[PDB]
Amino acid sequence: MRETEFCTHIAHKRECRICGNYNSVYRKYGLFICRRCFKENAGKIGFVKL
Amino acid sequence: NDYRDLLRMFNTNIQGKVVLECALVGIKGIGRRFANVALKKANIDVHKRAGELTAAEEDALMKVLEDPLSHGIPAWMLNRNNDFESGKDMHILVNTIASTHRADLERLRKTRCERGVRHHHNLKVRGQHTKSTGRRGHVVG
Amino acid sequence: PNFRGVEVEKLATMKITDILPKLNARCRRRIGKHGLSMKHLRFVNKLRLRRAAQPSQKPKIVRTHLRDMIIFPEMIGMTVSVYNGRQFIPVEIKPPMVGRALREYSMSYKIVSHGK
Amino acid sequence: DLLERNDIEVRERDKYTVHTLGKKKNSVAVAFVKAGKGDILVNNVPLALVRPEILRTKVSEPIMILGESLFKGLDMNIKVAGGGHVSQIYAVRQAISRGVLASVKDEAARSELRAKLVSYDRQLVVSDPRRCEAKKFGGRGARARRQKSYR
Amino acid sequence: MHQKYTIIVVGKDLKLVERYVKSIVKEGRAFGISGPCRAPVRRLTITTRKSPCGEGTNTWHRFELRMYKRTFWVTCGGNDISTILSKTVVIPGIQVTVEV
Amino acid sequence: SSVTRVPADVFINSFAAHLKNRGIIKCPAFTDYVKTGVSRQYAPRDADWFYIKAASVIRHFYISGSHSIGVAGLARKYSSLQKGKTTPHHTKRASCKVIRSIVSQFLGQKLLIAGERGRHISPNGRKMVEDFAEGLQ
Amino acid sequence: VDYPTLFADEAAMNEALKFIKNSKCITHTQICERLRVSVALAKRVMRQLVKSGDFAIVSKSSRMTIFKNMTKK
Amino acid sequence: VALFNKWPLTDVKCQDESLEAYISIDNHSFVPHSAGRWSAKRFRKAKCPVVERLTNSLMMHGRNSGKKLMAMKTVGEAFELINLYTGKNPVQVLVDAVANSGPREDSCRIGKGGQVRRQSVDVSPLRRVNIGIYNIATGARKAAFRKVRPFAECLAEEIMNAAAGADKSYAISQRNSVERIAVSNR
RNA sequence: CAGGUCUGUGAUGCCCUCAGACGCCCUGGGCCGCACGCGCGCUACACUGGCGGGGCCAGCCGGCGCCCGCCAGGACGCGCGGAGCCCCCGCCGUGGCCGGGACCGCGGGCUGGAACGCCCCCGCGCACCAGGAAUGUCUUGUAGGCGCCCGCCCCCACCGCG
């Protein structure tokens, strides 16, 4: 039934913690953060420009 | 030393000046059938030059090229190993390699294989991008 | 006519496990090293039902979306239609076809058809 | 691997009163020096013989200049980490040049030798200021940029 | 009494982590705290194309969040180590963790 | 010291001779077909390559001393660039089987004793390797 | 093209040597250019001159090796 | 002190009075590998050791970029070949080779409005020292390329042929060609 | 600045879609199909070079032992480790050759639900023998030569950040 087929695992689903976008999720460190969404919230995390 | 200017064996005139391993490369796929150096264990000195070869050495060299298990050289040094139609690990050499590409192509054509159509219509299998750099002279091919 | 040194008919009467020692490196990994799926096994279930046990020699067709299926010698001289993503493509499985993927023998592209 | 936590731990003290450092583009020569026989080991290998040939004469260059007999009576356990084959030889030479001077004692004669050596080969007692520059986003190098496709 | 304690001090700001170090040194006179060990900073580095859209020269925004850790080892009783930690001045966004 | 005093290149070639004349190591002879690792494209033509390789590997074991060395680790010392592709060359350490075989013979000839992690040169071996270097020079 | 590369000299051994000696200093490739022989061949010839005491190795390298006759007068 | 501690370094002298100040053998010291800020200021390169600049132009065409070690070894193998044939100091022949190989005359646009005529001009002694060292270096490379003669034998002869003044040297012929063009548009 | 992104955004006007959905899943293929013209790169065009050994020097910042296998890989175990270039000796001897490595014929493997990805070995041996008109980048640790790291990463880079 739809129950037995809905979302059968096919792949890992990885989304920015802030925006939920699959593209450019970023796994470099624990930060699963959108590449575009990162820049907006970099300051609260404290990542800073040299 | 007594030398043979051109060594006619294997349908390839073999130059006498070249070193034995390098001259033997000119014999179709052989000369590399020994990975470029397996006659050294089987019979001849590894680097004596092609014309320094002697009748006894020539007979010995041909026997090991003909028989892989004569000196028990492994299938890793050999060419076709599973063999679709032979079930044998024999190295394919001389006229047989020229026959084998055509022979395999007949199988690639007989089974309606996706590879086979590309082979007959002279295209490339995979190669990733096949539109941009495939072209050789106003045509890929 | 010989396949892997057998006369030719010798291959037909064989389970995949029987011909597995004499197989290509890749088809050892999928059949034995990693095993097969139950829906893929259901394809074999559909074919034992549709085998010589199936009534009549007239075609029973059989259309499968499944593409990555190394063919067993049980399918020698069998014809079925496999999806290219748009059309199920009839292909004659045969002793040469065995030991290779079913996906390649059906074709999805357009053969280029260029020169426009 | 340059500037390791222990500057010299394979040999510690053991009469090694003189200490010197020679720097050469990520090449640090941590030199342990004692008043010994007069032969020296660099990275536990004899100073007179090093694996590169052209560089061997350069490695012996400060020795002859600041009095080979003066250097006699001094044993060294200099270790060079980091850098590269050429960088390493220049940093051992800087350490060697400084190493004899500190031990000799500061007097008119020491000063005369120091002047004679630093004139013969400049920047022998002075660590090279130049340090590898940093690649920017423009291209592949610190100064080089990518090719301009449309001018 | 003599039971060893390994403590770790982690802070985004060097000055803020320095404040905890200076406080620990002052309150470590009573329980014989070890001298501080300043770890090589481990940096979370994100270089991102600044432009949300590709239009424009490809340009790179370099973001760095180096994390500073200080190491403290005290062979002292647990009440004593808790006494140094509670008494030492605490600044928000500074992490101190103890491992036995 | 003293091992350093002999030019290491001079010691390695002589040690291969010492191995052959004194019967130490014994080249496997299954080494004939193998090339020295993935990078090499033409295969060793020296014909004393196992004796030549063995001489340096035992000298390397002496050079490390107590440090302790592993079969994959020795291959990193013997690494060379891999060429022949459009993609640019990348360094490739040597194949483990030949190196592992060399370490095995030394443990039998008392030149190697297992330590924590990798094996290290045995005390009987330490004297033999050092004695040869001083004797040769 | 200096094609012969197997100690080819048969009665021109002396001639090749008269040429080699006529030159106060020779190089392996200078032999190959001056005469019709390959540089690899020169490497084996040069040896029977050095050992006899005809020529002296002034400079040595796997690449460039330079030989000068001891006397010749 | 001797060049490479083999060929004796004596009081090598300069025969030109123009190339005397800009060619330097006084600061010649074993191995021309000295790491110096010679490419600094505008005139520091003048005090450079003659062999060092010649050595630096050997790592060229991108094939050998940065290979000073190999370049010194080629300078060394060449130095010996010159020493063997001429029986004198290579460091003296190298000085004669550079002074002769330097084009004496040059020509330049002078930016006379639209006219691009190459009106003749005098040369800098320093510029002459560089062109001569460059001509010897690029000629030596042309002679080799796909030839049996390897670069060390080519470099030695090129210095030896430039020193006499023979037209065959690329270094001399470049000097001759440039000055023939310079008189033509004087 | 009508530069670009509504396809990063519980960003968003307004129209369309809305149960046979432009919701959401499930399958197989697509984006990688090539008569073509072009942009960014890579590897070449060899002796200043390849190739066989011998030494061995790094930074960003980072772990390994044992055995089996031609490698590839894997099993077993555990607390840790490190390039090229270059240098020294050999081989080739100017030959599309021992320059160069392009497709394809197999074979052995990996990540994988799954190659249609990658890897290695044994064949094969593509043009190019230095690029026309045109233009680009570039000044001290600089260009270039030469490797390594990291990103996206199931597997993968010739790419970019370094």
**Residue D22: its H or E element:** strand D18-23
Residue C34, Ramachandran bin (φ over 0: left; ψ between -120 and 50: alpha; else beta): alpha
Q: Can you name the residues that pair with F17 across neighbouring β-strands?
A: none
Q: Which residues of A13-45 are buried (b: 16+ CB within 10 A; e: fewer)?
A: eeebebeeeeeebbeeeebebbbbbbbebbeee
Strand I nucleotides, any atom under 7 Å to a protein CB: 3-5, 8-10, 24-30, 32-44, 46-59, 61-62, 64-74, 78-95, 97-98, 100-125, 129-130, 135-148, 150-154, 157-158, 160-162
C26 close contact with B: CB closer than 8 A: no
Q: Which two tokens stand for residue B19?
A: 């070193």
One-letter-per-residue 3-state SS of chain A: CHHHHCCCCCCCCCCCCCCCCCCCCCCCCCCCCCHHHHHHHHHHHCCEEC
- Please answer whether residues G49 and G67 qualify as being in contact, where contact means their C-beta atoms are separated by less than 8 angstroms: yes
In a domain, B111, yes or no: yes
Chains with ≥3 Cβ pairs under 8 A against G? B, H
Q: Which residues of E57-69 are buried (b: 16+ CB within 10 A; e: fewer)?
A: eeeebebebeebb
Q: What's the domain count of chain F? A: 1
- Helical axes H170-184 vs H90-101, angle rounded to 10°: 20
CA distance C49 to chain B (A): 26
Domain interval for residue F15: 2-131
Give the CA-trace dihedral at C77, C83, C86, C87, to 10 degrees. Answer: 20
What whole-number distance in Å separates Cα of residue H87 and Cα of residue E66?
Answer: 66
Q: Can you name the residues that pair with G26 across neighbouring β-strands?
A: G67
3-state secondary structure of D37: coil
Instruction: Answer whether E44 sits within 8 Å of A36, measured CB to CB.
Output: no
What whole-number distance in Å separates Cα of residue D90 and Cα of residue D24?
Answer: 6
A27 close contact with E: CB closer than 8 A: no
What whole-number distance in Å separates Cα of residue H69 and Cα of residue H52?
Answer: 12
User: Which backbone phi and psi does D42 adopt, to 5 degrees?
Assistant: -110, 120
For G24, how many CA atoms within 13 A lie in the half-sphere containing its CB?
9
CA angle B1, B5, B11 (to 5 degrees): 130
- Residues B65, B82 share a domain: no
**Per-residue DSSP letter, F69:** B
What whole-number distance in Å separates Cα of residue F123 and Cα of residue F112?
Answer: 8
What whole-number distance in Å separates Cα of residue E38 and Cα of residue E68?
Answer: 8
Instruction: Answer whether F7 sits within 8 Å of D46, measured CB to CB.
Output: no
Q: How many CB atoms are located within 10 Å of the residue F32 CB?
A: 19
Residue type, F32: D
Q: Which two tokens stand for residue F56?
A: 């340096």
Q: Which two tokens stand for residue C37?
A: 């799926």
3-state secondary structure of H12: coil
Instruction: Answer whether B46 sits within 8 Å of F47, measured CB to CB.
Output: yes
Burial class (CB in 10 A: 0-12, 13-18, 19+), H29: buried
Residue B114, Ramachandran bin (φ over 0: left; ψ between -120 and 50: alpha; else beta): alpha
Reference F132, options F46, F26, F5; nearest CA is F5
What whole-number distance in Å separates Cα of residue B58 and Cα of residue B48?
Answer: 13
What whole-number distance in Å separates Cα of residue E90 and Cα of residue E99?
Answer: 19
Chains with ≥3 Cβ pairs under 8 A against D? E, F, H
Q: Can you name the residues that pair with H120 across neighbouring β-strands?
A: H107
Q: Where are the alpha helices (DSSP H) in H27-169?
A: 50-58, 68-86, 90-101, 125-143, 151-164
Chains D and C touch (3+ CB pairs under 8 A): no
What whole-number distance in Å separates Cα of residue G31 and Cα of residue G45?
Answer: 10
Residue type, E34: S
What whole-number distance in Å separates Cα of residue D45 and Cα of residue D49?
Answer: 8
Q: What would the DSSP string read from start to end of B7-21?
A: E-GGGS-EESSS-HH
Domain interval for residue B106: 75-134
- Residues B40, B59 share a domain: yes
Coarse DSSP helix, strand, coil percentages of chain G, rounded to the nearest 5 percent? 40, 15, 40
- Please answer whether residues C74 and C43 qualify as being in contact, where contact means their C-beta atoms are separated by less than 8 angstroms: no
In a domain, F120, yes or no: yes
What whole-number distance in Å separates Cα of residue H45 and Cα of residue F26?
Answer: 60
Q: CB-based contacts of A38: which residues, under 8 Å, 6+ apart?
A: A16, A26, A31, A47, E46, E48, E63
- Going by DSSP bridges, is the β-strand pair C78-83/C88-93 parallel, antiparallel, or unpaired? antiparallel
Q: CB-based contacts of E39: which residues, under 8 Å, 6+ apart?
A: E68, E69, E70, E71
Q: What's the residue count for chain F?
A: 137
- Please answer whether residues E16 and E91 qualify as being in contact, where contact means their C-beta atoms are separated by less than 8 angstroms: yes
Reference H28, options H75, H60, H65; nearest CA is H75
- Residues B95, B52 share a domain: no
- Residues B85, B47 share a domain: no
Long-range contacts of G33-37 (CB under 8 A, 24+ apart): G33/G2, G33/H148, G33/H149, G35/G2, G36/G2, G36/G3, G36/G4, G37/G2, G37/G4, G37/G5, G37/G8, G37/G9
What whole-number distance in Å separates Cα of residue D32 and Cα of residue B85?
Answer: 73
CA angle E26, E27, E29 (to 5 degrees): 75
Burial class (CB in 10 A: 0-12, 13-18, 19+), H131: buried
Reference G63, options H149, B116, D131, D59; nearest CA is H149
**Residue D30: its H or E element:** strand D27-34
Strands (E), chain E: 4-11, 37-38, 42-49, 60-75, 94-99
What does each C-alpha distance from E12 to E67, E91, F44, H37, H182 come to in angstroms? Answer: 5, 12, 56, 42, 69
- Residues B20, B63 share a domain: yes
What whole-number distance in Å separates Cα of residue F22 and Cα of residue F59?
Answer: 17
Q: How many CB atoms are located within 10 Å of the residue D74 CB?
A: 20
What whole-number distance in Å separates Cα of residue E16 and Cα of residue B40?
Answer: 72
What does each C-alpha distance from B47 to B54, C88, F35, H42 come to in angstroms? Answer: 14, 60, 17, 57
Reference F95, options B76, B104, E97; nearest CA is B76
Cα dihedral sign, H147-H152-H157-H163: positive
- Please answer whether residues H91 and H25 qualify as being in contact, where contact means their C-beta atoms are separated by less than 8 angstroms: yes
Burial class (CB in 10 A: 0-12, 13-18, 19+), H75: buried
Nucleotide nearest to H140 (CA to C1'): I48
What residues of D are in contact with residue F4 (Cβ under 8 Å)? 41, 44-46
What whole-number distance in Å separates Cα of residue C91 and Cα of residue C110?
Answer: 17
Q: What's the domain count of chain B? A: 2
One-letter-per-residue 3-state SS of D91-137: HHHHHHHHHHHHHHCCCHHHHHHHHHHHHHCCCCCCCCCCCCCCCCC
Which among B57, B74, B91 is the end of a domain? B74
Q: CB-based contacts of E67: which residues, under 8 Å, 6+ apart?
A: E10, E11, E12, E41, E42, E43, E44
One-letter-per-residue 3-state SS of F76-123: HHCCEEECCCCCCCEEECCCHHHHHHHHHHHHHCCCEEECCCCEEECH
What whole-number distance in Å separates Cα of residue B55 and Cα of residue B62?
Answer: 11
D128 close contact with H: CB closer than 8 A: yes
Coarse DSSP helix, strand, coil percentages of chain D, rounded to the nearest 5 percent? 30, 15, 50
Residue type, C5: G
Residue H108, Ramachandran bin (φ over 0: left; ψ between -120 and 50: alpha; else beta): beta
CA distance C48 to chain B (A): 24
What whole-number distance in Å separates Cα of residue B105 and Cα of residue C92?
Answer: 18
**Residue D41: its H or E element:** strand D41-42
Residue type, B121: H
**Per-residue DSSP letter, H7:** B
Cα dihedral sign, A31-A34-A39-A43: negative
What residues of B are in contact with residue G6 (Cβ under 8 Å)? 1, 3, 16-17, 49, 51-52
Cα dihedral sign, G29-G31-G35-G41: negative
- Please answer whether residues B47 and B21 qualify as being in contact, where contact means their C-beta atoms are separated by less than 8 angstroms: yes
Chains with ≥3 Cβ pairs under 8 A against F? B, D
Resolution of this structure in Å: 3.3
CA distance F137 to chain D (A): 14
- Which residue is it, tokens 């044993």? D75
What whole-number distance in Å separates Cα of residue C75 and Cα of residue C93?
Answer: 6
CA distance H109 to chain D (A): 27
Radius of gyration of chain A (CA): 15
- Please answer whether residues D46 and D55 qualify as being in contact, where contact means their C-beta atoms are separated by less than 8 angstroms: no
Q: Which two tokens stand for residue E16?
A: 């803020």
What whole-number distance in Å separates Cα of residue D90 and Cα of residue F78?
Answer: 27
Q: Which two tokens stand for residue B39?
A: 């006659």
Cα dihedral sign, F67-F69-F73-F74: positive
Reference D33, options D77, D94, D79, D88; nearest CA is D77
What whole-number distance in Å separates Cα of residue D88 and Cα of residue H140?
Answer: 32
- Please answer whether residues D117 and D68 qualify as being in contact, where contact means their C-beta atoms are separated by less than 8 angstroms: no
Radius of gyration of chain B (CA): 19
Burial class (CB in 10 A: 0-12, 13-18, 19+), H158: buried
What whole-number distance in Å separates Cα of residue H20 and Cα of residue H5?
Answer: 24
What whole-number distance in Å separates Cα of residue A22 and Cα of residue A34?
Answer: 8
Q: What would the DSSP string read from start to end of C53-114?
A: TSS-SS----EE-----BPPGGGTTEEEEEE-SSSEEEEEE-TTTTTSBHHHHS--S-----
Q: CB-based contacts of E36: which residues, under 8 Å, 6+ apart?
A: E21, E24, E25, E70, E71, E72
Q: Which two tokens stand for residue B121?
A: 């219509």
- Please answer whether residues F41 and F83 qualify as being in contact, where contact means their C-beta atoms are separated by less than 8 angstroms: yes
C5 close contact with B: CB closer than 8 A: yes
What does each C-alpha distance from D119 to D69, D116, D122, D125, F33 come to in angstroms? Answer: 20, 5, 6, 10, 59
User: Which backbone phi and psi does H131 adopt, to 5 degrees?
Assistant: -60, -40
What residues of B are in contact with residue F47 (Cβ under 8 Å)? 40, 46
Q: What would the DSSP string read from start to end of B77-108?
A: TSS--S-TTT---PPP-HHHHHHHHHHHHHHH
Q: Which two tokens stand for residue F94?
A: 């040597």
What does each C-alpha distance from H160 to G48, H9, H80, H156 come to in angstroms? Answer: 30, 18, 12, 6
What does each C-alpha distance from B64 to B4, B29, B60, B91 come to in angstroms? Answer: 21, 15, 7, 11
One-letter-per-residue 3-state SS of F40-57: CCCCCCCCCHHHHHHHHH
CA angle B80, B41, G3 (to 5 degrees): 90
Q: Which two tokens stand for residue E85?
A: 């930690």
User: Which backbone phi and psi does H69 adopt, to 5 degrees?
Assistant: -60, -55
Q: CB-based contacts of F90: which residues, under 8 Å, 6+ apart?
A: F81, F82
For residue G37, the chain B residue with the least C-alpha distance is B17
What whole-number distance in Å separates Cα of residue E20 and Cα of residue E30?
Answer: 16
Q: Which two tokens stand for residue B124?
A: 């490339």
What whole-number distance in Å separates Cα of residue B113 and Cα of residue B105?
Answer: 10
- Please answer whether residues A42 and E46 qualify as being in contact, where contact means their C-beta atoms are separated by less than 8 angstroms: yes
- Please answer whether residues H18 and H4 qualify as being in contact, where contact means their C-beta atoms are separated by less than 8 angstroms: no
For B67, how many CA atoms within 13 A lie in the half-sphere containing its CB?
9
- Going by DSSP bridges, is the β-strand pair D75-76/D41-42 parallel, antiparallel, or unpaired? unpaired
Name the structure determination technique.
Answer: cryo-EM
Q: CB-based contacts of C70: which residues, under 8 Å, 6+ apart?
A: C16, C27, C30, C31, C99, C100, C101, C102
What whole-number distance in Å separates Cα of residue H128 and Cα of residue F64?
Answer: 55
Task: Find which of B76, B80, B85, B105 to mutate to test the C interface (most C CBs within 10 Å of its CB).
Answer: B85
